[PDB]
């Protein structure tokens, strides 16, 4: 008017086809939006802070710490960013019996990032007047010959006698020491005499934090791996500066090696069959590693490191732009 | 939408306006074209970036979280652990989904408002030197060349400068 010049106010459209939901309206095509939800992983188990996990593989935590002969690959392991059991982690206690407070031991290990293994009661040195062979046993075989745990030492009679031992270790490692022993409960024994030379025997283990006596329960028990005897496994965490004392007249499966523990946050035990690879991640799940800065993920509730928050959602898209109306 | 502009009295968007979320189209003797409004786009980008950053800040990363084991005589505590893990997951899934829905509503309305307020700000500059011809457009009652168009876009339109020529045209009809 007169010449018809015009100005119009309007808003952007584009060819975006992403949609967001609102409360009033589902599937609204917007011009710009962001996805808040990570749903991708690389299908591998990776290092954190340059440290590889510990892959126990065919072994479980019990076979690892006790030193099952099938776990010899683990002997040199001293530090890890997390611990991995697989769906085939079955080599644990090769000589049958209960691992006492095992779920607690697993909870403790979950905050251990490394250790220093050492020979707590060196074999054939700390035991001048007891036998140190046989067992050994076929239940725990290696290369088709009876063998034993690499960390425990099965003590036996020195020909018909067995004097009340008293072996004591003082913790001068400057940290907690995890000490494992066993107590053997032979069947109709007989065997009791044949191994320990004394029939009314006992084991006693003492420190400030822990004190317990064990009487052998000699009895008829089903065969497990050709063995009708059973063996109970025990652990304790010896405090820095404190003293642990073993006393017995038989049936002691004694500590040979023990572990000096380094605590660390951010570590843990996971079950995964994914393969380990030389990759690095800040976030690890049992399905695989996440490389993401998104605030949520739907991959797995189990996480090592620093991860997005697990939610059940399959979609979380947040609008940034406006309703997209490229054509009328 | 709540403010009546987007998919409202301004029926559709413009794929031809590339530089921003809101802006202008003009036609005069020199030609036609689009131009984003920078100030309104900037303020919207400030709010939306802040909104997204606030969502991120409230939702903390999760650090190491692993399972626990229980023996065959610890079913009560095993189930309690389960109830805790499931319940917190229910609550965080609910919170995340709902915050997204609620904020998406508010985001589309904010854009709608912004368009409305830009329309009204231009209308209020032009007064009766232009007529409203629907769909977010104004027809000037005077010749408006590119310098004049730019004065509208930058908020310094000179009503008195064009008032007489406008009035003569407006009073002809």
């Amino acid at each position, epitope marked *: 008017a007169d010449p018809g010049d015009t100005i119009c106010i309007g808003y952007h459209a584009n060819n975006s086809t992403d949609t967001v939901d609102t409360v009033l309206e589902k599937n609204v095509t917007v011009t710009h939006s962001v996805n808040l939800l990570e749903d991708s992983h690389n299908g591998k188990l990776c290092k954190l802070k340059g440290i590889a996990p510990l892959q126990l593989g065919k072994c479980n935590i019990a076979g690892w710490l006790l030193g099952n002969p099938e776990c010899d690959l683990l002997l040199t392991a001293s530090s890890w960013s997390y611990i991995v059991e697989t769906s085939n982690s079955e080599n644990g206690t090769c000589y049958p019996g209960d691992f006492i407070d095992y779920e607690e031991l697993r909870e403790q290990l979950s905050s251990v990032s490394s250790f220093e293994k050492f020979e707590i009661f060196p074999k054939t040195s700390s035991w001048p007047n007891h036998e140190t062979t046989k067992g050994v046993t076929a239940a725990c075989s290696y290369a088709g010959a009876s063998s034993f745990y690499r960390n425990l030492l099965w003590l036996t009679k020195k020909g018909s006698s067995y004097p009340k031992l008293s072996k004591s270790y003082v913790n001068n490692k400057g940290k907690e020491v995890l000490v494992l022993w066993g107590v053997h409960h032979p069947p109709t024994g007989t065997d009791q005499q044949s191994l320990y030379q004394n029939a009314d025997a006992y084991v006693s283990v003492g420190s400030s934090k822990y004190n317990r006596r064990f009487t052998p329960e000699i009895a008829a028990r089903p065969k497990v791996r050709d063995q009708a005897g059973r063996m109970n496994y025990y652990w304790t965490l010896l405090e820095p500066g404190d003293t642990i004392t073993f006393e017995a007249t038989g049936n002691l499966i004694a500590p040979w090696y023990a572990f000096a523990l380094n605590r660390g946050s951010g570590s843990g035990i996971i079950t995964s069959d994914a393969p380990v690879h030389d990759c690095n991640t800040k976030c690890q799940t049992p399905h695989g590693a996440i490389n993401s800065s998104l605030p949520f993920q739907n991959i797995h509730p189990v996480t090592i490191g620093e991860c997005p928050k697990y939610v059940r959602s399959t979609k979380l898209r947040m609008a940034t732009g406006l309703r997209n109306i490229p054509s009328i | 939408g709540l403010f009546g502009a987007i998919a409202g009295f301004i029926e559709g968007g413009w794929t031809g306006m*590339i530089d921003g979320w809101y802006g202008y189209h003009h036609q005069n003797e020199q030609g036609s074209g689009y131009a984003a409004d*920078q100030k309104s786009t900037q303020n919207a980008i400030d709010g*939306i*970036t802040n909104k997204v950053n606030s969502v991120i800040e409230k939702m903390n990363t999760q650090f190491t979280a692993v399972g626990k084991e229980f023996n065959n005589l610890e079913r009560r505590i095993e189930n309690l652990n389960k109830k805790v893990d499931d319940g917190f997951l229910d609550i965080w899934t609910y919170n995340a989904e709902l915050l997204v829905l609620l904020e998406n509503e508010r985001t589309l309305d904010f854009h709608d408002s912004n368009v409305r307020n830009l329309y009204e700000k231009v209308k209020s500059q032009l007064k009766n030197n232009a007529k409203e011809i629907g769909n977010g457009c104004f027809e000037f009652y005077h010749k408006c060349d590119d310098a004049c168009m730019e004065s509208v876009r930058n908020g310094t339109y000179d009503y008195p400068k064009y008032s007489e020529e406008s009035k003569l045209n407006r009073e002809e009809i």
Partner: antibody
Amino acid sequence: EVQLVESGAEVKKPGSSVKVSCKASGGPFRSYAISWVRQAPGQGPEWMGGIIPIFGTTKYAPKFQGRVTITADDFAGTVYMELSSLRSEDTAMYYCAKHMGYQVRETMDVWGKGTTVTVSS
Amino acid sequence: VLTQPPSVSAAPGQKVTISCSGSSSNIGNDYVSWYQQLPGTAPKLLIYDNNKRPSGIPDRFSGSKSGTSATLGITGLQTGDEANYYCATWDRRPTAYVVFGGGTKLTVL
């Protein structure tokens, strides 16, 4: 104020590519654009290109168009510059720098400290 | 490109001006910014929008723009002002891009 931290020094062969990163503090989403500017010794700076927030639009200098790609990971608060088909005259200090608003322009108010790229056979 | 003198000098307290000459596609219809650069550091913004000062920059520095040319003025000259100075603007022409001047080295005697 914002701090802009760039990735470490790079040494590359002619014909290869280099990718440099710039992480902006705060955020992580940004209401302002960020450009890459380089400076060969002892020459003036040359604007390579920049990227607009939300829109993701890029603009490149004619001298680099066709072989520079600028990208953003907004949840990481990071922008990247990839320069391909490297030549020995791509030997320079590479700076990120932010603009005052969402649009790329001549005014860049905060700069990274720069990272060196050396291209040699 | 924009044309600057390669090198300007003065004495403490004295005043020097660095000029920036372009064309109608660049300085002619766009805002001019100025950058200072010391050895081993990133360009630092001194003036934007032809003559505005960011905070941190003192009224000793100022800038001007006239037609196709821009000017940086430095009064009260100091030792620490010894540096390279670059002008910058938007060139709408070939394809749009930010162009910088070739640089002026200020030496303080």
